[PDB]
Ligand binder design. Structure first.
Ligand SMILES: CCCCCCCCCCCCCCCCS(=O)(=O)O
Ligand SMILES: CCCCCCCCCCCCCCCCS(=O)(=O)O
Lengths: 131, 131
């Protein structure tokens, strides 16, 4: 996934608060998340891909092998089972917890990196540009 | 309540979607409500006060006597018991339904009419100016 490597900064967000609402994130956390304009850092070392999100309030980091299910603790503190695959040039992530699931797709669009999150019909789109 | 009589147009909104979230309003309805910039019309005839809200998508109207509980069907279709009193120069409304309650205060602030809605700690503020 060479096309994803680098540091990216958030440029725009659409329906993010609504997505967090469906996921079950609390008011305060949603408020903190909404003011945060995180920087996404993606790097690859061998068959391990690392995705790091940095914000003044909270940094998250996941390292994984494409196709292998792993444990992830989300920024809003959910302990989920995640699996990320490379499909059609996009990184497709599915998170499962308590009988529920959500999909997060990271894809290239022109010179931007677009992240789409889907939870029960509600879709959020966040656009990033290289920092 | 002579100070409230007239037609008012929405000028600004703060945390309205979050308030609707706490009240239990669905995604689609919240989306329609968020694009609506309603006009509030207040009039008094004898001891009956009428508050009418007009929008391209939905008009609501309630007529009541201050201090007497009455039935109200909200824009989001909840059938509630409402009671409105005049306290400290402000119209204070309490809506009760299914063991829950929310308070809506309509007050004058300078030349504006301010509406504050509170639901479980979440507070929304909407400012109106004369049309
Ligand atoms: C108290 C600190 C709060 C920090 C933010 C917390 C956010 C909690 C909700 C996270 C939902 C999942 C986000 C997936 C990546 C979206 S994207 O950002 O990668 O595009
Ligand atoms: C499909 C049509 C949708 C129309 C809008 C529906 C809104 C539903 C939620 C209403 C919550 C209560 C609003 C109190 C007055 C707020 S204020 O507006 O008077 O300031």
């Amino acid at each position: 996934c060479d096309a994803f490597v680098g540091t990216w900064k958030l440029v725009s967000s659409e329906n993010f608060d609504d997505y967090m609402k469906e996921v079950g994130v609390g008011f305060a956390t949603r408020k903190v998340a909404g003011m945060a304009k995180p920087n996404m850092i993606i790097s690859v070392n061998g068959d391990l891909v690392t995705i790091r999100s940095e914000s003044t309030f909270k940094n998250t980091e996941i390292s994984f092998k494409l196709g292998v299910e792993f444990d992830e603790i989300t920024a809003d503190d959910r302990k989920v089972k995640s699996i990320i695959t490379l499909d059609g040039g996009a990184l497709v992530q599915v998170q499962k917890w308590d009988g529920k699931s959500t999909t997060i797709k990271r894809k290239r669009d022109g010179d931007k990196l677009v992240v789409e999150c889907v939870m029960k019909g509600v879709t959020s789109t966040r656009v990033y540009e290289r920092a």
